[model samples]
Target: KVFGRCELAAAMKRHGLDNYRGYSLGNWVCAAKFESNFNTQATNRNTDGSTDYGILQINSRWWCNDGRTPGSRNLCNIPCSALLSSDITASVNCAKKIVSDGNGMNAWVAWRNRCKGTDVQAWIRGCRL
Candidate 1:
């Protein structure tokens, strides 16, 4: 399932997320460019093919079976719901906890600052304090 610019942009807009698109996009690129070459369906053997599962590189072991699924009985079942549910804020929050666990944006900001040579990402990450 290849995602084009329109599809990806639409998803970003629908999620009410602007800055994250670049960060996540970069993450995707880096994940692929440096690590796995953008393999959304990539998996590792150490976690029973569950580590960083799916397109966003979401980890299933830590998020699913590790009691972080949050209001779900199983993590394996959360991905579809996360992707389908229109309340993407919930999904983003879940990602925050799982990915940066409240600091994910900070990492993104730092990366953006260093990579893109802009303070906007830092401002966004820092909440403009």
Candidate 2:
């Protein structure tokens, strides 16, 4: 388990994610809430036989290999299980790379469907960062 919203914000800030890729920390927080509820071990199997992994719910078809998916791009060069860790350093780094590769937060469907155009400021309402 991870910290609460406020503590998560502080941790993300310390990890240099307060404002990344022109997106605010609120964007990440909002996405995290809907995608995985800040639980690093979260996983959701998609209808297309692919799986979403970690807090960001990165898809196995494009991001990481879950060993069950053949011909996975595994662009992050990481095992899907790595993302399901309490220490999110590697996951954050991979997410940053994903955002930098021009996907922005669009890589996360949760962000597109929930966070986009939404008032996400409440995500950091009580954060001290």
Candidate 3:
């Protein structure tokens, strides 16, 4: 696992992503929680023969190359394995690029389904960043 909500928040702050692209740190935390329970090594095979990687669950279809996949857009230009590392710097950078290119955090299905319009204060509660 990479971080609890508090640590994740602090790291995100260091990366200047605490309030990036008009989305709160809480939203990012919530998405990460649902996506992979903050596990950097998390992976999920999609029904469409693609896979999601890392804490943010970035899809192999669009963000990174999985090698076996034939037609990945790989807009992030990084391998999927890179996101599986405990170091979240690359994942955060790729997420920022995806947010800028798409409809903000809505690009993450977990955010749209679980975090949108929900009270997410618990995500950052009791964290002394």
Candidate 4:
């Protein structure tokens, strides 16, 4: 499912992404916008032999179990297919688990290079809640 900016923010916020892991809602929303354009079905395979999946682009290398990451621990304990679902609950849960780990959001290079330390409040402009 493709989402509008506000709707996606609302969903992420509803799922407890707001202020999660010391990152504001805009930080996450901004990352998702750049990562997958709010697409529940988005995917990207890196040359490093890892495939990132779903809206937040969780990777098979450390998170979801895709059987292709080679020695993957599947720390999120979720099937890769779960990330592809439009409901987004699985992907959201996975993303939260990732941030709550010792690693910072910098694990997402996209967020680090794109939205980190930037003024992302505009990303959620005009959205109530």
Candidate 5:
């Protein structure tokens, strides 16, 4: 689903990420597959893009970013462009931290709560099958 390096590099650059290989990218891909069906351009307008929306499909209005700038949503404290750009894993992790401190399991919960039934485990689980 990741396709190639261009998109991957785009994701990494957007989040200002470094050393994002092996498990880090793996974890991000895992989360993305569950969260947005690996749709890089995916956006959820269902709740007016307020709750659990975007490529990572985060709910900015509800989560509220700590590092928000003026006249912006801040997106649970992280930059929205970072969410749209590379380092998809970092974006997802940031969302996880905003919503649940640092627990990766909390990411799974949030993904399921919003993007459930989208072959949530296809990357980590189905790939094994």
Candidate 6:
């Protein structure tokens, strides 16, 4: 599912992404917009042979299982549905799990490069609460 900016923000906020566990609302929105363009089914095949399959684009190299990555940990024991569902509830929950494991959003290149030192609120401002 391809969600609009405000639409995606509202949905994420509904699911406790709005500073619920230390992440700002824009933090989630920014990472998703950059990583997956707000498309629930987006998948990135990395050179490491792992798949990032979610709006958050969580890597199969660690959390999710791809059944093909060379040294994947499958730390979360996730399935395709959790990262691909349009409803996104399960996907978002899994993202939160990664938050705890990775000790915040350091694992993602897209996030660290673009939104890390930037004004995340600017990304979330167009959306109304």
Highest lDDT: give the candidate number.
4
Q: Which parts of model 5 are misplaced by more than 4 Å?
A: 1-31, 48-55, 64-75, 98-110, 113-122, 125-129
Q: Write out the backbone clash pairs for model 1.
A: 32-37, 32-38
Which of the predicted structures, 1 or 5, would earn the higher lDDT when compared with the native?
A: 5
lDDT of each: 0.39, 0.83, 0.88, 0.89, 0.46, 0.84
lDDT of 4 by residue, 70-98 (tens): 87778888999899897888988988888
lDDT of 6 by residue, 14-114 (tens): 98888956879898899999999999999988887888888999888878776788877877777755888889787788788888874588767898898
Identify the runs in model 1 with alpha carbons over 4 angstroms from their true place: 20-40, 46-50, 66-93, 105-129
lDDT comparing candidate 4 with the true structure: 0.89
Per-model TM-score, in order, reads 0.43, 0.92, 0.94, 0.95, 0.44, 0.90
Return whichever of 1 and 4 wins on lDDT.
4
Ordered by TM-score, highest first, the candidates read 4, 3, 2, 6, 5, 1
> Which residue segments of model 6 deviate by more than 4 Å?
none
- lDDT tens readout by residue for model 2, 1-129: 665888767767777887889889999889888988998888999877889888778888988888887677888899989888887776787888888987788888779999999888889997788
- Candidate 2 has an lDDT of 0.83
Each prediction's number of clashing residue pairs: 2, 0, 0, 0, 13, 0
The alpha-carbon RMSD values of the candidates against the true structure, listed in the order shown, are: 8.5, 1.3, 1.1, 1.0, 7.3, 1.5
Sequence-dependent TM-score of model 4: 0.95
